Design a protein around this ligand. Structure first.
Ligand SMILES: *[C@@H]1O[C@H](CO)[C@@H](O)[C@H](O)[C@H]1NC(C)=O
Ligand SMILES: *[C@@H]1O[C@H](CO)[C@@H](O)[C@H](O)[C@H]1NC(C)=O
Lengths: 212, 167, 214
């Protein structure tokens, strides 16, 4: 196979900035290189073919160059809606090899999380399990810390997290920390709180509720 | 005189095509004797030559394009024996299939085409002695002069086309 | 324009075979093009499986030759991918894409379909509501399902502003789980109800759930 090594694998630019992604091929592949944009959960979109031919339907902001063992993708005026992973793809010889990918993350003003807490529903309580949710909505950057307090007694191991990928519009993140308990351990305590640390916060913010 | 290529399955009469060039590979390693065997890597070599017709064949270009005044050989790198040699003809050679499992090529016309291709390979490589040897070997789609025709796929043995020396 | 939609089962227990069909609309499979299957795994990347011509010609990735079959159904205007002897290694997203005269670019793609190689059973999720600084936050908690994915919407696609459908997470039970949340002005909690529509086409449950305050 022909090895496609991109560079870098993850970068961070601003709205209006000029982004540059390189792709090195092991062999001389002439000009048979293609650039793909893939936004989260969507199918790849052909930006460029023949390392330079702007696929019709793509902005002229996007541009391609190189021929041989080195190639460049340039985005000459980055926008909120370019949050994607970009792939360089072989075409000279089967198998068409791909690059590992370059993760272009949109960088913006620091933003404080809206912290919401959710009690476990009366539905699930009957099932025998409780799922308390701590949401951190529209913040930046993805650095956050979430700790749980059950009657002030700190929790370790019973929480797990999941983060949305950056938004297309404002490029904020959203974080979810799920505290799961059994019914007997849930009925053992009253005040349930989650505390949040973030770069945008003056002090750590806590949100709480009493069982029932 | 004529040359009869054995083809299985038998191509019908209406697959009687024109050869418009072929694709070679210089055999690397080591006498002032340069050895060429018909290329059979992947379909992307045959593609990259771009002397390619709608007919998707290997070894020989069927119903492809013709050069102007005379044969023109081409390569992405004359030193890289990995890189194939796209030979393009000027005046085509007819391959006619009787549909009995046999396809025929004029010995005269083909020998002539070899003489020319040899001459040009000589210009490029500067040698004196040009040897055509049969397919180096591989998967059946390449090691044999293969092609599609009417949706059906055929193979032909071509070791009878590439077995001569030139000076 | 040309359009591709995949179909076929998103679960295949080990040893067995993955059958998957690309349906082509607004263009014939008897054109001048090739038709390709590509799989994509988080962490692993993009891997080209194989391609086929309208004239029954078939190119397969060396790594998968022993296992792979591509076929063209000219009557139904489709092509299909059949992978035998599947392993956990094949757990990925499977796209059908049409190049353009094996000229480099994979022009039009299909939406792709996810395929797990797991020896665990299929089951639907349970949907628990999530109800309560000037702005209010609602949600639907989708807990304990297999396999992926789930199709969570709000007010049947009328309220997609402010919505955040978090990525799933595999439990130690081997069941996926996630939440979908939504911000709405506080003064609208009583004026209207918000109803999430969770689909899970694996076990085909079209669960709705009303979210009302306390
Ligand atoms: C190629 O051209 C010849 C003309 O001599 C024609 O008979 C044949 O049907 C064409 N196509 C193929 C696939 O052979
Ligand atoms: C194929 O070869 C014959 C040789 O006489 C030529 O006359 C004919 O034009 C070729 N086929 C086509 C249709 O180009």
């Amino acid at each position: 196979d022909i090895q496609m090594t991109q560079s870098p694998s993850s970068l961070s630019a601003s709205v209006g900035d000029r982004v540059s992604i390189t792709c090195r091929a092991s062999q001389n592949i002439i000009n048979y290189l293609n650039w793909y944009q893939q936004k989260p959960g969507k199918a790849p979109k052909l930006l460029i073919n023949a390392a330079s031919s702007l696929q019709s339907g793509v902005p002229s902001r996007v541009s391609g160059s190189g021929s041989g063992t080195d190639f460049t993708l340039t985005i000459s005026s980055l926008q909120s809606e370019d949050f994607a992973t970009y792939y360089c793809q072989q075409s000279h010889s089967t198998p068409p090899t791909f690059g590992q990918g370059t993760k272009v993350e949109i960088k913006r003003t620091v933003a404080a999380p809206s912290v919401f807490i959710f009690p476990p529903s009366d539905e699930q309580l009957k099932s025998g399990t409780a799922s308390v949710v701590c949401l951190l909505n529209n913040f930046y950057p993805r650095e956050a810390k979430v700790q749980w307090k059950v009657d002030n007694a700190l929790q370790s191991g019973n929480s797990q997290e999941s983060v949305t990928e950056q938004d297309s519009k404002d490029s904020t993140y959203s974080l979810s920390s799920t505290l799961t308990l059994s019914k007997a351990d849930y009925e053992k305590h009253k005040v349930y709180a989650c505390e949040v640390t973030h770069q945008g916060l003056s002090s750590p913010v806590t949100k709480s509720f009493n069982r029932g | 005189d004529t040359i009869t290529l054995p083809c299985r399955p038998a191509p019908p009469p209406h697959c009687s095509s024109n050869i418009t060039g072929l694709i070679l590979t210089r055999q690397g390693g080591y006498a002032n004797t340069v050895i060429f065997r018909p290329s059979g890597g992947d379909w992307r070599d045959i593609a990259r030559c771009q002397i390619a017709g709608t007919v998707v064949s290997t070894q020989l270009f069927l119903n492809g394009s013709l050069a102007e005044e005379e044969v023109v050989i081409r390569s992405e790198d004359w030193r890289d024996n990995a890189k194939s040699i796209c030979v393009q003809l000027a005046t085509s050679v007819e391959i006619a299939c009787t549909g009995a499992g046999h396809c025929a090529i004029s010995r005269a016309k083909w020998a002539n085409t070899l003489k020319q291709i040899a001459s040009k390979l000589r210009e490029q490589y500067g040698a004196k002695t040009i040897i055509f040897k049969p397919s180096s070997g591989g998967d059946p789609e390449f090691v044999n002069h293969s092609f599609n025709c009417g949706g059906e796929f055929f193979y032909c043995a071509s070791t009878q086309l590439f077995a001569s020396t030139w000076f | 324009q040309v359009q591709l939609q995949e179909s076929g089962p998103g679960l295949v227990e080990p040893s067995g075979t993955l059958s998957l069909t690309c349906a082509v609309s607004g263009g014939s499979i008897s054109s001048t093009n090739w038709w390709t299957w590509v799989r994509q795994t988080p962490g692993t990347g993009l891997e080209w499986i194989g391609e086929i011509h309208h004239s029954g010609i078939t190119n397969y990735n060396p790594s998968l030759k022993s296992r792979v079959t591509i076929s063209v159904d000219k009557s139904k205007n489709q092509f299909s991918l059949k992978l035998s002897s599947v392993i956990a290694a094949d757990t990925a997203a499977y796209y059908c894409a049409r190049g353009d005269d094996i000229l480099t670019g994979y022009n039009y793609w299909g939406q792709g379909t996810l395929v797990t190689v797991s020896s665990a059973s299929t089951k639907g999720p349970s949907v628990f509501p999530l109800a309560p600084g000037g702005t209010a936050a609602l949600g639907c908690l989708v807990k304990d399902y297999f396999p992926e994915p789930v199709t969570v919407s709000w007010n049947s696609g009328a309220l997609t502003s402010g919505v955040h459908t978090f990525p799933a997470v595999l439990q130690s039970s081997g069941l996926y789980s996630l939440s979908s949340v939504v911000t709405v002005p506080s003064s609208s909690l009583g004026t209207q109800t918000y109803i999430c529509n969770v689909n899970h086409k694996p076990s085909n449950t079209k669960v709705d759930k009303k979210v009302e305050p306390k």
